[PDB]
């Protein structure tokens with residue numbers, strides 16, 4: 323059967339930010355985000371921390387108080403993790419019940435394989 327593995331964005335192609343970069347570098351990356359959500363991590367995808375809704379960050383950035391790293395991090399949501407090889411069928415449900423919209427595909431070793439989205443699953447199912 324067709325599985326999550328077939329449609330995920332491969333690990334190498336996941337857009338995220340190393341929260342270790344100097345602040346000006348982090349903001350520059352944030353404002354240049356090619357996607358709606360992006361991964362916050364420390365050093366590499368061996369240490370993914372949270373999923374940040376870019377639109378939310380932008381929104382916070384426009385406000386009166388200085389936008390900070392602390393503010394950014396508390397604005398991100400915990401990552402939703404999907405086992406490797408979960409079938410599209412099963413994931414469709416766990417996402418419907420989840421109302422979550424994005425997941426990181428993960429090994430049994432905790433090793434991120436890719437990124438998957440409900441948009442992605444549906445469009446595949448229907449073609």
Ligand SMILES: Nc1ncnc2c1ncn2[C@@H]1O[C@H](COP(=O)(O)O)[C@@H](O)[C@H]1O
Nearest residue numbers: 331335336337357358359360439441442
């Ligand atoms: N942070 C990301 N890194 C890599 N690919 C992504 C990311 N977010 C979304 N995508 C893919 O690009 C598609 C368009 O989403 P978006 O650009 O956020 O509207 C999604 O269905 C994902 O498959």
